[PDB]
Write a structure and sequence with these properties.
This is part of a larger assembly, with 2 copies of chain A. Chain A contains 4 helices and no strands. By secondary structure, chain A is mainly alpha-helical. Chain A is rod-shaped and about 70 Å long. At the A-B interface, α2, α3 and α4 of A face α1 of B. The PDB classes it as motor protein. The entry lists the keywords striated muscle, asynchronous flight muscle, motor protein. Lethocerus Myosin II complete coiled-coil domain resolved in its native environment. Chains A, B: Myosin heavy chain isoform Mhc_X1.
């Protein structure tokens, strides 16, 4: 049973590390969408 | 050798858990960074 409490781990660890590989897009989808922003509003404040 | 190897897996039960909460809460200020600036995107482009 001590290995039974071991074996049910790495099941959800594959879920959470994929979930950890899930959030890196929302990490990265912001970073492009801010580099599309502060580069254009810095261009836009230059236009004003 | 079980419990020394086991405790490293429960560290990843905590590390992959909290680093998931590291991102989406960092996403919250990231999503706050967008819509409160995108309102200022329209108003300055309204001025042009």
């Amino acid at each position: 049973k001590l290995q039974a409490q071991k074996s049910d781990l790495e099941s959800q660890l594959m879920d959470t590390q994929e979930r950890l590989q899930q959030e890196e897009d929302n990490r990265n989808q912001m970073f492009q969408q801010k580099k599309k922003l502060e580069q254009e509003v810095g261009g836009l404040k230059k236009d004003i």
